[PDB]
Amino acid sequence: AAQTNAPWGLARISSTSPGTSTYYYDESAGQGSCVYVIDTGIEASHPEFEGRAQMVKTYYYSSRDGNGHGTHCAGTVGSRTYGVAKKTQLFGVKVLDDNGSGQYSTIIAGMDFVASDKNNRNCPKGVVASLSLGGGYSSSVNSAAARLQSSGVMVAVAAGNNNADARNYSPASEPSVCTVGASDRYDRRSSFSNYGSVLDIFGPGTDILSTWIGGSTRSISGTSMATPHVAGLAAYLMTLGKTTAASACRYIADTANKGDLSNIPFGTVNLLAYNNYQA
Ligand SMILES: [Pr+3]
Ligand SMILES: [Pr+3]
């Protein structure tokens, strides 16, 4: 299948070179997989989700996304127009308040929740969790991410936006998950993207158009935007049977565009998420 005039990030993950405008993908499009978006919530009623999005848990007074951030990330995972895996099932877990913040204890509870909740869902092709959040280093937060991964969920987390070594941030610094840096449409490391040896992969993160609350759209930037590209890519690959939750990050790294990025510090991987689609 082919989506013409796609957002640049979708086109980039189906090309060996920057500058293309078509997103090439297999028609299966992540059908039968599930992605938990652990964030500010999801505006599930947005037309772009086509009824495939559902709030399953909130840690605040409402399950509504009063912020937009979670809806944006969810859109990059699996919205019709802006999503990588256009037929995946989306589950929202609201661990961040409408200001975009949350206590570590709540974020940990949300991860433990997903590990259990997935056992009550029909996700025959597998389960992904997308975490576009983080803060200063915490061994408890890292441990929670490692548990979630161990439970059989592909965990993708943002590297952080501090232009620093991600070793000092959580859950970015947990080695066993998939830590995602950001790039721009000219294949440069995004100027805000964290780096370091703990990064596994880069994805498009600068000027990413996706869904927003109030049934709208907007373009924003961050490693928050790169992470759902990789989460959606994992769902897509799991549906195709190419990989499993345990090995998806490694498979994505193995099959990535290599050496294409500029402004990558020595010691950081030069790997850009790529779906390897061949008609
Ligand atoms: Pr290339
Ligand atoms: Pr890793």
UniProtKB/Swiss-Prot annotation:
Its cofactor is Ca(2+). The keyword Ribosomal protein does not apply. GO terms for molecular function: metal ion binding; serine-type endopeptidase activity. It catalyses: Hydrolysis of keratin, and of other proteins with subtilisin-like specificity. Hydrolyzes peptide amides. Its EC number is 3.4.21.64. The keyword Signal applies. GO terms for biological process: proteolysis. Binds 2 calcium ions per subunit. Keywords: Calcium, Disulfide bond, Hydrolase, Metal-binding, Protease, Serine protease, Signal, Zymogen. GO terms for cellular component: extracellular region. Disulfide bonds join 34-123, 178-249. Ca(2+) 1 binds at residues 175, 177, 200. Residues 7-279 form the Peptidase S8 domain. The active site is at residues 39, 69, 224. It comes from the Eukaryota. Hydrolyzes keratin at aromatic and hydrophobic residues. This is Proteinase K. It comes from Parengyodontium album. The chain holds residues 106 to 384 of 384 of the full protein.
